[PDB]
Design a protein around this ligand. Structure first.
Ligand SMILES: CCC(=O)SCCNC(=O)CCNC(=O)[C@H](O)C(C)(C)COP(=O)(O)OP(=O)(O)OC[C@H]1O[C@@H](n2cnc3c(N)ncnc32)[C@H](O)[C@@H]1OP(=O)(O)O
Length: 164
């Protein structure tokens, strides 16, 4: 291959069926754990391997270099962004943005035009660059008890424009 690849992966029932995917999920778990050191490792493991969660993985030379773990709520009309990370040495090259753009294109194709996420204070500017806002248009009745809340984090929303 020799080039970056985007793979939407996860655990559909059991992770043993596809070893390549398993290895990538472990890779993701490790990247998320390293780049989100305040999240418990067991918690990251649990969600990455949860059948209702998918992860858009960025793979370079068979190695996970970043990912966005998410959960789609089609009937609610949004997706929850759960974890978002690029490995350290590959940061500040445009990959965090590429990832999010890819994720947006994927969701436009699935007619889900809202992302919700809880952002750490020191990550807010990243989300803002990706078009997220603190102003939430998804009604609280729609996301309360659907999305996971976090301590001291700021709820942010991206309204996707499918046009162009
Ligand atoms: C909501 C769920 C969560 O995970 S909350 C926390 C978000 N994730 C993390 O904090 C994990 C640790 N951080 C990272 O992995 C990376 O810093 C992330 C956020 C993924 C960005 O990856 P990276 O590959 O460097 O992205 P990039 O090259 O496309 O550049 C990012 C562009 O956004 C801008 N930005 C503005 N404010 C911030 C900020 N507070 N942190 C990071 N980036 C920020 C950058 O300046 C950059 O824009 P530009 O290229 O200068 O125009």
């Amino acid at each position: 291959s020799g080039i970056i690849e985007f793979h939407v992966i996860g655990n559909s029932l059991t992770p043993k069926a596809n070893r390549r995917v398993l290895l990538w999920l472990v890779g993701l778990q490790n990247v998320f754990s390293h780049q989100l050191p305040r999240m418990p490792k067991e918690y990251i493991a649990r969600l990455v391997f949860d059948p209702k969660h998918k992860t858009l993985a960025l793979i370079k030379d068979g190695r996970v270099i970043g990912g966005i773990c998410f959960r789609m709520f089609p009937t609610q009309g949004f997706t929850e962004i759960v974890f978002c990370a690029v490995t350290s040495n590959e940061q500040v090259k445009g990959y965090g943005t590429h990832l999010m753009n890819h994720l947006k294109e994927y969701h436009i194709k699935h007619n889900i035009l809202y992302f919700l996420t809880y952002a750490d204070e020191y990550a807010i500017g990243y989300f803002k660059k990706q078009g997220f806002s603190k102003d939430i248009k998804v009604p609280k009745s729609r996301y309360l008890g659907y999305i996971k809340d976090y301590e001291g984090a700021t709820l942010m929303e991206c309204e996707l424009n499918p046009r162009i």
